[PDB]
Amino acid sequence: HHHHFYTLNIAEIAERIGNDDCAYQVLMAFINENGEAQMLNKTAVAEMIQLSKPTVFATVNSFYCAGYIDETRVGRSKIYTLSDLGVEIVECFKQKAMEMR
Amino acid sequence: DHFYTLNIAEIAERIGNDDCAYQVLMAFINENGEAQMLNKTAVAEMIQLSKPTVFATVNSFYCAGYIDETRVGRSKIYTLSDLGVEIVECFKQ
């Protein structure tokens, strides 16, 4: 293509994500059973979520743009990992009620 | 009280460099430079990408606080948030 600081309320972000089935699952996909932040590609993320690939891929790409996950290029592939911001958003889900994940 | 200090310059660069995110955010700025309200269907018709891609992007932009949502009857109408406005401002100068 040709077209190549703020105080954020992450509690309110957690609330909105909590109410979006795909967003919630994409974010928590990066947390393992031990509760640690793991590295994944989009294919991996999509494999643990029962929604279309285009939907999941776009959500992953959006989360990168938003600064919730960082990107590591390897060959033609991209590996994603939670950022500091992404982890703090995850932490907002501690003792938070969830309705139909 | 949990707030986070966001570097808008970083987000701005990431959004700017991604053809999909840039197009979705900028959809909300009319040809005259004024902010405008749009539903998901209108955003999709403005962009040469699949409907599922565009819809998921709008949804994640809402979650991120880049766009605000108003209910009109049963529909969801979206506008740039104060944060959304600030990101666009990074392109402006």
Residue B28 in contact with residue B80, Cβ under 8 Å?
yes
CB of B61 within 8 Å of a chain A CB? The answer is yes
Q: Write down the experimental method used for this entry.
A: X-ray
Of A1, A59, A68, Cβ closest to residue B56: A59
Q: CA-nearest residue of chain A to B9?
A: A5
Helix or strand run (H / E) with residue B55: helix B51-63
Helix (H) or strand (E) holding A31: none
- Residues A63 and B64: their CA atoms lie apart, in Å, by 8
Assess A6–B contact: CB distance below 8 Å, yes or no.
Answer: yes
Domain ranges of chain A: 1-101
Contact B35, B80 (CB under 8 A): yes
Q: In 3-state terms, what secondary structure has residue B83?
A: helix
Q: How far is the C-alpha of B89 from the C-alpha of B80, rounded, in Å?
A: 12
| B8 vs A92: CA distance, rounded Å | 21
Q: Which amino acid is at A4?
A: H
Residue of A nearest to B63 (CA): A16
Specify the DSSP class assigned to residue B38: B
Cβ atoms of residues B59 and B66 within 8 Å = no
User: Is there a contact between B38 and B77 (Cβ–Cβ < 8 Å)?
Assistant: yes
Chain A CB within 8 Å of residue B11 CB: yes
CB-count burial class (<10 Å; 0-12, 13-18, 19+) for B52? middle
Q: Is B43 near chain A, with CB under 8 Å?
A: no
Question: Reported resolution in A?
Answer: 2.0
What architecture (CATH level 2) is domain A1-101? Orthogonal Bundle (1.10)
d(CA A86, CA A19): 17
CA distances from A15 to A39, A87, A101, B7 (A): 24, 15, 12, 22
Q: In terms of Cα–Cα distance, which of B25, B68, B10 is closest to A84? A: B10
Q: Which of the following CATH numbers is that of domain B1-93: 2.40.50.140, 3.90.650.10, 1.10.10.10, 3.40.1410.10?
A: 1.10.10.10
How many Å apart are CA B56 and CA B73, to the nearest integer?
Answer: 22
Which residue's structure tokens are 């294919």? A43
